[PDB]
Amino acid sequence: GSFVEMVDNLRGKSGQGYYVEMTVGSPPQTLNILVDTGSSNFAVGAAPHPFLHRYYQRQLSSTYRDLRKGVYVPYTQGKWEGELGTDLVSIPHGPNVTVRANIAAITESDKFFINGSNWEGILGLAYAEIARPDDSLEPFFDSLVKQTHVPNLFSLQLCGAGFPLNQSEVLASVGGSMIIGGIDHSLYTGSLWYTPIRREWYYEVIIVRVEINGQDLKMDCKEYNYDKSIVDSGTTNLRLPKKVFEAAVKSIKAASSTEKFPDGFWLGEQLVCWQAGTTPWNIFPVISLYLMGEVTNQSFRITILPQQYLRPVEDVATSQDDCYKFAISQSSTGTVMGAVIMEGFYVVFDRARKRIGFAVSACHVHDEFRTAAVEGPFVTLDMEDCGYN
Ligand SMILES: Cc1cc(C)n(COC(=O)N[C@@H](CS(C)(=O)=O)C(=O)N[C@@H](CC(C)C)[C@@H](O)C[C@@H](C)C(=O)N[C@H](C(=O)NCC(C)C)C(C)C)n1
């Protein structure tokens, strides 16, 4: 309920990523690690790279163990190859422990590291099932729970600023919190509502209904989880299956039709700008995702605002304009509840009880007329049928 030691231990932002400080090896080598609930490999740059200010030097760690085995990991965008081994790992602003964990030493990569992101590795927090080479490589959190008394769960509060941040600003500000082993009540308001983790591979959940300003998209619910629906702190946008994306964009365009935007905007590629302070938030609809509840035939809903799905970006011109990119895009691999969703809520990854909790975030961006919300319950039947097989 109270872990002041870990509150505000994250830095970063959408687009580039949210990261936590970790140390690896002996003596401790400090590295910034991206928090990624969408994968299960712990990996770190281990050789010079144009975008890396530092990297893992195995030859300088007295505790480094070479597993003599290579590993390859591809992501929706980006990929890397590395060499497997183990070493001692600690988290300065996390529990006071030291765990021996598997570490992939990245030796080659493509479209993975991000210039200026300030992170040098990735912490895959999902399950062994999707770890590479296979489920035999124990993920970091599994090691943590097995080697310590830290409870089997963590929570994330990702904080979007609501406006663009320059390099010095992102470096000097709080990007959020990752509470390891517990929940901190100062990070949310209202109550926590839980949805079942369908299966332990990605953090998969089941969406049972979608609304645009209260109006039902009215699609066969399997379409919403077509292939799957996951919660991923390593993805910026709310990504939706092709059919759902098209239906959603049609409805969002209709609700905001008093103003017309170019196709490039809806494709998530180009920005739309308004005179400083005049963004017409009210013309854009709220989006509600209903999730299966823990009680039979019960569901709840999470609702985000345009302040969540319109991502702030700096306008090239020295203009004092407020510009944004549409942060909802299509996916051919299922729904991805990325930062667009996570910046609106405090998310509890309760692995012990196989469930994910959502509560309104104490740091979500909004205005005087609307706020993000988590509400329930709703009598919903045959939710099990919403899952895709
Ligand atoms: C917040 C935040 C953090 C970061 C780094 N961004 C910017 O990058 C992305 O949003 N990257 C997405 C691609 S996009 C722009 O939606 O199309 C992405 O691929 N994120 C991955 C992490 C980054 C650091 C490479 C991962 O979070 C996505 C996840 C679904 C994934 O690809 N998992 C892998 C996977 O499923 N691989 C199989 C196929 C897709 C190669 C694992 C299981 C091996 N936004």
The answer to whether residues 160 and 66 belong to one domain is no
Whether 232 is in the pocket of ligand 1, judged by its Cβ within 6 Å, is yes
Residue 10 lies in a domain: no
Residues 351 and 379 in one domain: yes
Q: Which atom of ligand 1 is nearest to the CA of 78?
A: 25
Token pair belonging to 145: 């729970």
Residue where a domain terminates, one of 125, 150, 175: 150
Domain-embedded: residue 1: no
Whether residue 315 lies in the annotated active site: no
Residue type, 243: K
Q: Helix/strand/coil (H, E, C) string of the chain?
A: CCCCCCCCCEEEECCCEEEEEEEECCCCEEEEEEEECCCCCEEEECCCCCCCCCCCCHHHCCCCEEEEEEEEEECCCCEEEEEEEEEEEECCCCCCCCEEEEEEEEEEEECCCCCCCCCCEEEECCCHHHCCCCCCCCCHHHHHHHHCCCCCCEEEEECCCCCCCCHHHHHCCCCEEEEECCCCHHHEEEEEEEEECCCECCEECCEEEEEECCEECCCCHHHHHCCCEEECCCCCCEEEEHHHHHHHHHHHHHHCCCCCCCHHHHCCCCCEEECCCCCCHHHCCCEEEEEECCCCCEEEEEEECHHHHEEEECCCCCCCCEEEEECEEEECCCEEECHHHHCCEEEEEECCCCEEEEEEECCCCCCCCCCCEEEEEEECCCHHHHCCC
Same domain, yes or no: 133 and 165 = no
Instruction: Point out the catalytic residue in the list 36, 184, 322, 350.
Output: 36
Establish if 2 belongs to a structural domain.
no
Determine which one of 142, 232, 322, 350 is catalytic.
232
Pocket test for ligand 1, best of 32, 33, 37, 39 (most atoms within 8 A of CB): 39
169 in a structural domain:
yes
Q: What was the resolution (in A) of this experimentally determined structure?
A: 1.9
Expt. technique: X-ray
Measure 236 CA to ligand 1 centroid, in angstroms. Answer: 9
Instruction: Identify whether residues 176 and 125 lie together within a single domain.
Output: no
Do 328 and 355 belong together in one domain? yes
For the chain, the domain total comes to: 2
**Domain range enclosing 109:** 18-150
Question: Do 91 and 156 belong together in one domain?
Answer: no
* Closest residue to atom 30 of ligand 1, CA basis: 38
Based on the residue annotation, tell me whether 36 is a catalytic residue of this protein. yes
Question: Final residue of a domain: which of 132, 150, 168?
Answer: 150
Cβ 176 under 6 angstroms from ligand 1 = no
Where b means 16+ CB within 10 Å and e means fewer, 56-83 reads bebeebeebeeeeeebebebeeeebebb
Cis amide bond preceding 133, omega within 30: yes
One domain for residues 111 and 251: no
**Ligand 1 centroid, distance to 75 Cα (angstroms):** 5
The CATH number for 110's domain is: 2.40.70.10
Query: Are 290 and 376 contained in the same domain?
Result: yes
> Which residues are CB-contacts of 382 (< 8 A; sequence separation ≥ 6)?
none
Together in a domain, 146 and 197: no
17 lines ligand 1 (CB under 6 A): yes
